[PDB]
Amino acid sequence: ATASDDEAVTALALSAAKGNGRALEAFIKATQQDVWRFVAYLSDVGSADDLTQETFLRAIGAIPRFSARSSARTWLLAIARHVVADHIR
Template structure:
């Protein structure tokens, strides 16, 4: 029984979960590993799934937690300190700078993802969920355990920050090309 539920969830959502993770960590192999971790957690905890949310939002909540654990672990390894990693305010920047998936993207997408790395973890998570994964405000709020108002506010601030970062980037490039 559990195995058939697992296969149904995997078949229905694996690609979405994988894409979500790859946008966060920017590395195919790491995203695959994290994706596997998501489904290990799904197998371990499906008995406790109470259906208060959709299976999709439940899976994304697990994927979000797996990604946060990954960033926390890397922050500790990188800094060699055990300071608390606050994913809500810290930037979620993958330690791997040139993933093969970015090579396949166009310049605009690369600029957007670079700018997204300069946003807070909250902002990055909301933008990826809302615009890359096309989740609704309600689904995003449910996954993040926030109010819809907080999602809207965070989204608004993220878009403003991205607009400012991308405008600055374009202006710098224009000035560089003129000189």
């Protein structure tokens, strides 16, 4: 529960959406690894660093509108997917 984990991350996201910086920072720390793994499956490993950060830049942009209609991980990986879709080419 692990899903206990998802819960924190969602919480971080919700606080970050309300303008809490230190929560945005921790959110990115908590999820960076997941985004990197996901992103590298869907292209290469050489791509992933660059795709990972693009994902976070969009995340940073969209987070003010995250309201937990889904878990923050799902929301974040949906963005990761758009970033990968764009990148081809």
